[PDB]
Amino acid sequence: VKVAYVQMNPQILEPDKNYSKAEKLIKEASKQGAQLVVLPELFDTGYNFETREEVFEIAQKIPEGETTTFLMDVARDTGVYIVAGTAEKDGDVLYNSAVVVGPRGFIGKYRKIHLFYREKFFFEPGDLGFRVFDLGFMKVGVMICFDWFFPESARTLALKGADVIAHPANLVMPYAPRAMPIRALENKVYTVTADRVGEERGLKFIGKSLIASPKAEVLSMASETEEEVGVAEIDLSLVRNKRINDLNDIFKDRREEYYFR
């Protein structure tokens, strides 16, 4: 099975422009054979808000709102599964979320657990835990952006049987691209970090989207500045068998009685 990132430059406060760009690139990923496509964090709203009001005013409910229903449409037309970062309105509150859709409809959502820098001024910390979505042919865990920084994020997803971790990102620090192959290695999973590119009100994003294998190899890596799609095939066996040799299995060998105490 082929998985893909879409690396795009979301236009702040312009969802329709971002829907148009997303559809375009998701179609390119589809045409290159991808079955799972991952978009960046906050792909619909952009990131660097001055005020909560400017995002709250346009943020969409999940699953009834425009971002989710747009993605359903594209999933249905292209026949791919999509994981995409979106601002989530839920009553008076806002979450920094990711929605999971398939060609047959809405699958689920994840709310970012570890908020980064000024996100804490706009978003409520995620409260649904680290979820793994079973697509039948594979299990997809989701984490967003700065969640990478905590090794417990990827570990919790891998422990719940993620085959691939879809990872919408809007990276500003330089570290994640070198850390993601380690996250893939230490859990024996695949990772798909779909980063944005661009400059938004003085803040520059690092691009460098990448697909990492359970042997910490980089299967696809994107430029710093360009909008692009990257596709790689993934080996479900390389991830469903936690053996690293005949004497060691990663999950059998963990000794939780000695961790965090």
Tokens describing residue 162: 């993620």
Residue 7 to residue 207: CA distance in whole angstroms: 7
Minimum distance between the CB of residue 59 and a copy of itself, rounded to whole angstroms? 21
> In the chain, count of helices (H) and strands (E)?
7, 16
User: Which residue has 């994020």 as its token pair?
Assistant: 153
Does 38 carry a binding-site annotation? Answer: no
Looking at the Cβ atoms of 21 and 183, the one nearer to a copy of itself is 183
Q: Which residues are at the interface with a copy of itself (CB under 8 A)?
A: 113-118, 120, 125, 129-130, 146, 149-152, 155-156, 159, 175, 178-179, 181-182, 185-186, 216, 245, 247-248, 250, 253-261
Q: H/E element holding 2? A: strand 2-7
Residue 64 to residue 72: CA distance in whole angstroms: 11
Closest to 85 (Cα-Cα) out of 117, 41, 54, 52: 41
Q: H/E element holding 192? A: strand 190-195
Strands 81-90 and 36-38: parallel
Minimum distance between the CB of residue 135 and a copy of itself, rounded to whole angstroms? 22
Looking at the Cβ atoms of 130 and 133, the one nearer to a copy of itself is 130
Looking at the Cβ atoms of 33 and 125, the one nearer to a copy of itself is 125
Minimum distance between the CB of residue 193 and a copy of itself, rounded to whole angstroms? 14
Tokens describing residue 70: 């747009």
Minimum distance between the CB of residue 205 and a copy of itself, rounded to whole angstroms? 16
Residue 169 to residue 193: CA distance in whole angstroms: 6
Using CA atoms of 89, 90, 93, 99 in order, give the dihedral in degrees to the nearest 10. Answer: -60
Give one DSSP letter per residue of 193-237, joined into a string.
EEE--SEETTEEP----EEE-TTS-EEEE--SS--EEEEEE--HH
Looking at the Cβ atoms of 1 and 182, the one nearer to a copy of itself is 182
Looking at the Cβ atoms of 237 and 245, the one nearer to a copy of itself is 245
Residues annotated as catalytic (active site), given as ranges? 41, 112, 145
Q: Residue 165 in contact with residue 190, Cβ under 8 Å?
A: yes
Does 172 carry a binding-site annotation? Answer: yes
Minimum distance between the CB of residue 172 and a copy of itself, rounded to whole angstroms? 10
Annotation: binding site for substrate: 172-173
